[PDB]
Amino acid sequence: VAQISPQYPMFTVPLPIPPVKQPRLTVTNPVNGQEIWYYEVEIKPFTHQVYPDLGSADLVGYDGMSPGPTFQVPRGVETVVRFINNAEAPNSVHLHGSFSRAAFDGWAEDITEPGSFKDYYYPNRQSARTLWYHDHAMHITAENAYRGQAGLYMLTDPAEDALNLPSGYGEFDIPMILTSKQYTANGNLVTTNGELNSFWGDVIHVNGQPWPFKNVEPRKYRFRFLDAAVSRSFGLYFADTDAIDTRLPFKVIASDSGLLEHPADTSLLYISMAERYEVVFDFSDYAGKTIELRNLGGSIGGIGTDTDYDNTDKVMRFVVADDTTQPDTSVVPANLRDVPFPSPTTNTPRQFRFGRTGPTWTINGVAFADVQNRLLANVPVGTVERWELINAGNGWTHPIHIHLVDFKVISRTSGNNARTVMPYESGLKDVVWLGRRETVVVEAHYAPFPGVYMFHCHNLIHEDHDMMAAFNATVLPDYGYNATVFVDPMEELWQARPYELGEFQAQSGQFSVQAVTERIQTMAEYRPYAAADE
Ligand SMILES: *[C@@H]1O[C@H](CO)[C@@H](O[C@@H]2O[C@H](CO)[C@@H](O[C@@H]3O[C@H](CO)[C@@H](O)[C@H](O[C@H]4O[C@H](CO)[C@@H](O)[C@H](O)[C@@H]4O)[C@@H]3O)[C@H](O)[C@H]2NC(C)=O)[C@H](O)[C@H]1NC(C)=O
Ligand SMILES: NC(=O)c1ccc[n+]([C@@H]2O[C@H](COP(=O)([O-])OP(=O)(O)OC[C@H]3O[C@@H](n4cnc5c(N)ncnc54)[C@H](O)[C@@H]3O)[C@@H](O)[C@H]2O)c1
Ligand SMILES: *[C@@H]1O[C@H](CO)[C@@H](O[C@@H]2O[C@H](CO)[C@@H](O)[C@H](O)[C@H]2NC(C)=O)[C@H](O)[C@H]1NC(C)=O
Ligand SMILES: [Cu+2]
Ligand SMILES: [Cu+2]
Ligand SMILES: [Cu+2]
Ligand SMILES: [Cu+2]
């Protein structure tokens, strides 16, 4: 249907690459003698000239940018990020893809108000993967993400660097953060506030930029795709502009949780909200051509319900040089890793139905705000469970995210007989798309940390109103590892704290090297991640 946003100068602005976030300093962990990397992120309003000929757009971003700066953390290095709220609404930061303790996981009620900050202590122990950090504050997640509270967090591993995949952040390893937004006639954003169904958006962005281009060399590039949209799911394919409908083959090498066992040869990538897929596209056969990254219409080929507009088929353009500057010395190995799948289980799966109760998106008839009923599962830490995730609906689709766990997609059924499990779903994931009338069974190890965690639809409109519930990964009174201060996400030790803007800007008081050092050393003494010591 007709684009509502003003006409954009398509494929005229280069793909921006979020800058790498650098730690401010490192603190000696007194427990193990190891350096914890300490970062400061200031959440703050800013404007961006999205449309060259109109007004600017009001955004609120990590370090006053959108997307947020890209973290780059080696496995084994613990991180503390101080997220400082200097904006006009509360925040709760979730590191999506991280087995963070309950009080470091962005629990929706665990907010930071303006004039407060929270210290988030991250383990960085899991398999190399593309994580992303984004807002999760109760009822306002859609608008905080949409206005720019989302960024990339790359967990790296020398074992994976040895695979010799296309490499170099912003070189041949390119972040591809997809969003879908709507603008006013004056080039500001149309708010998601009030929207209770879905906010599709009609303007497709990569890394915060409508319909960009990038100059590429005729060689292999690694693309880290993230659907950071409020409501839009994609069916991604690449086509030569001389044959705009002919899908060019590529390889999927990674899902949410990291590398697949083997690359998946693919010409169409289904990607819904919060899913990450890492692609190697080989431009060597298309020297001198323009390749368009495109998006499947008819509501993602009948899998979705998303509205399609005049330009939502277009994502961006790659302009392929005649030659390389230097040889492509990268490969895509047939054997990427042994995926650490859970031990299969025969116990009857739990059932979760993603539907609506009046005007509210619900799980098993419950809204997250109904505290009394929203705890839908107690799972003893160490258990492997199958959950059957049911979308009986034809009029909505639900990408389901389970916090804490990596899971295996066991099965999909479709009441429109559309598809079963996809080859790029072969590995470990933390989000799975329930298309129209789809039921998916996932299997997960509920390990290794006890605590109360969320699971929900990652359609942020659905999430906010109010398609989200909790599970408790439980332990016995004798388990140890300081579980009594780490199971409740609202534990007062880990709560946000007020600050004065003067002390932040002068890096004095609570922001002095001495206060930061004392705070982190105190947090580290409780040993949040010791139970995953192997
Ligand atoms: C999510 O699951 C966690 C477990 O992983 C769970 O935390 C556990 O809560 C229970 C009950 O509150 C705790 O056991 C308590 O220990 C304290 C302190 O010594 C006592 O106050 C309690 O004693 C009363 O109740 C006993 C048991 O019925 C009676 O025998 C006694 O007479 C007392 O009246 C009680 O034993 C346990 O310590 C925690 N475990 C941890 C590791 O924190 C949590 O409650 C669950 N969360 C939610 C939101 O459901
Ligand atoms: N167990 C039960 O309660 C029960 C009994 C009989 C039938 N059903 C099932 O109900 C389903 C209804 O048939 P359908 O596939 O035509 O509809 P559906 O499942 O897509 O929609 C169910 C209801 O929600 C409404 N709806 C759809 N999309 C919506 C959206 N985005 N926002 C708000 N409301 C929306 C529909 O108009 C309808 O009134 C069938 O699959 C049928 O098998 C359930
Ligand atoms: C649980 O957390 C407490 C509090 O940080 C730890 O107790 C501290 O332990 C360190 C090193 O053993 C001491 O120097 C501190 O003086 C302790 N503080 C208190 C209040 O006791 C304890 O080690 C942690 N337990 C586990 C199993 O991690
Ligand atoms: Cu998320
Ligand atoms: Cu998450
Ligand atoms: Cu949903
Ligand atoms: Cu979440």
Swiss-Prot record:
Cofactor(s) in the UniProt record: Cu cation
Record keywords, A-Z: Cleavage on pair of basic residues, Copper, Glycoprotein, Metal-binding, Oxidoreductase, Repeat, Signal
Positions bearing carbohydrate: 472, 482
Annotated ranges, domain Plastocyanin-like: 60-156, 366-488
Ligand binding (Cu cation 2): 96, 134, 458
Ligand binding (Cu cation 1): 94, 401
Record-listed E.C. numbers: 1.3.3.5
Protein name: Bilirubin oxidase
Binding site for Cu cation 4: 398, 457, 462, 467
